């Protein structure tokens, strides 16, 4: 659909 | 010797003028991110972005990671503004603070996963196994394909990366081969900062 993103850290 | 750019995190609407921009100024614009690509233009705020695949692979490659604002403001004037004033500075790993992008192209003589070996083990979501493997490889890391493909040779550090998010046991691993087992987010975080965060908080509890 659109481009994948990547949320939160560790 | 060549300028080649790729876009990340735009709508189809905003992509249009990056295309119109490309042809106007003779700049090569590519669909997907390659190894020739020297420029990663992506959406920000005035200059923070969201973490995309192309984002990580740009920082990893030592590319110029420049905002989409670079295009909007160089059309608003008339001439091509020099990207150097427009490179990104964060996302939500790093605030607009720890500008990883700059740090990467400047520290290539000194990669982050330099003396390490990495197995990308198991399923992953919206980042294909091999694509991640490549991101790691760019940042000085040596990729391993099975867990029993780690080196006897003593100078090396084995590290197994798993995305747990995409399973349904994986506290298992530790038993099979003896190397730290970390979430994918350790790779991701390390590239975004270009710093190589230590394994502590990314370590996955294992079942003995």
């Amino acid at each position: 659909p659109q481009s994948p993103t990547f949320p939160e850290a560790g | 010797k060549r300028m080649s750019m790729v876009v990340s995190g735009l709508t189809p609407e905003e992509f249009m003028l990056v295309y119109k921009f490309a042809r106007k100024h003779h700049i090569t614009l590519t669909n997907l991110i390659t190894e020739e690509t020297t420029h990663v233009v992506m959406k920000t705020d005035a200059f923070v972005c969201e973490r995309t695949l192309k984002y990580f692979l740009g920082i990893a490659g030592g590319k110029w990671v420049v905002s989409y604002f670079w295009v909007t403001q160089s059309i608003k004037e008339r001439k091509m503004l020099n990207e150097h004033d427009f490179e990104v500075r964060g996302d939500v790993v790093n605030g607009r603070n720890h500008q990883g992008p700059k740090r990467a192209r400047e520290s290539q003589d000194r990669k982050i996963f330099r003396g390490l070996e990495i197995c990308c083990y198991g399923p992953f979501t919206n980042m294909p196994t091999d694509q991640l493997e490549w991101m790691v490889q760019l940042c000085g890391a040596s990729v391993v394909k099975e867990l029993s493909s780690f080196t006897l040779g003593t100078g090396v550090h084995p590290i197994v990366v798993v995305q747990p998010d995409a399973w349904t046991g994986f506290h298992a691993i530790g038993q099979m081969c003896e190397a730290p087992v970390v979430t994918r987010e350790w790779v991701l975080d390390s590239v975004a900062l270009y710093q190589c965060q230590e394994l502590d908080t990314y370590l996955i509890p294992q079942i003995p």
Side-chain angles (χ1 to χ4, degrees):
Chain A
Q2 282 195 11
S3 272
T5 48
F6 294 97
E8 253 281 63
Chain B
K1 260 162 162 184
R2 178 62 123 261
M3 214 181 120
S4 179
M5 34 166 260
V6 76
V7 126
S8 195
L10 314 187
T11 40
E13 353 281 328
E14 302 172 325
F15 178 58
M16 289 274 290
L17 10 149
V18 172
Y19 175 78
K20 179 254 169 190
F21 185 85
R23 67 185 313 154
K24 177 160 177 62
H25 310 294
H26 309 261
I27 322 173
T28 325
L29 173 60
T30 174
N31 184 72
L32 272 150
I33 175 74
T34 61
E35 230 158 341
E36 288 77 33
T37 290
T38 42
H39 278 37
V40 173
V41 176
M42 47 194 288
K43 196 156 179 61
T44 50
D45 53 358
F47 288 139
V48 179
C49 58
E50 284 192 32
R51 277 144 103 254
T52 56
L53 173 59
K54 282 181 186 172
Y55 175 57
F56 295 118
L57 285 167
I59 303 163
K63 332 282 195 204
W64 275 100
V65 203
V66 200
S67 87
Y68 164 73
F69 265 110
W70 171 64
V71 195
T72 19
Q73 206 135 57
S74 52
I75 281 162
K76 267 161 76 88
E77 249 93 294
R78 254 301 328 171
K79 295 276 98 186
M80 273 213 354
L81 291 182
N82 84 305
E83 324 75 55
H84 288 40
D85 304 350
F86 274 96
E87 76 176 307
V88 49
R89 319 167 89 137
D91 50 71
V92 84
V93 169
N94 46 356
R96 24 174 298 162
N97 214 284
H98 270 29
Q99 1 114 154
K102 318 211 181 215
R103 216 166 176 82
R105 44 182 199 90
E106 292 166 36
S107 296
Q108 284 291 49
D109 50 24
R110 265 218 35 145
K111 294 143 179 304
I112 59 170
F113 318 131
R114 185 201 324 268
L116 320 177
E117 268 168 26
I118 291 178
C119 193
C120 279
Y121 183 81
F124 296 90
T125 39
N126 335 69
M127 174 182 297
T129 329
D130 71 340
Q131 284 285 85
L132 147 55
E133 289 183 313
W134 182 44
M135 195 203 317
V136 129
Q137 274 212 108
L138 267 14
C139 306
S142 188
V143 168
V144 164
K145 269 314 211 302
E146 332 296 284
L147 295 174
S148 54
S149 265
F150 281 126
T151 306
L152 197 84
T154 193
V156 85
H157 288 46
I159 282 175
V160 176
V161 174
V162 183
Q163 194 217 17
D165 191 43
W167 294 56
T168 296
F170 52 72
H171 297 78
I173 329 308
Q175 317 170 313
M176 296 195 84
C177 72
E178 278 165 292
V181 193
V182 279
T183 168
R184 171 216 282 161
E185 274 284 328
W186 162 78
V187 170
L188 295 189
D189 276 346
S190 292
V191 285
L193 308 174
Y194 214 67
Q195 206 182 45
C196 183
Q197 261 13 264
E198 39 191 30
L199 315 172
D200 278 43
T201 54
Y202 303 92
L203 279 180
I204 301 169
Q206 299 292 289
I207 280 163

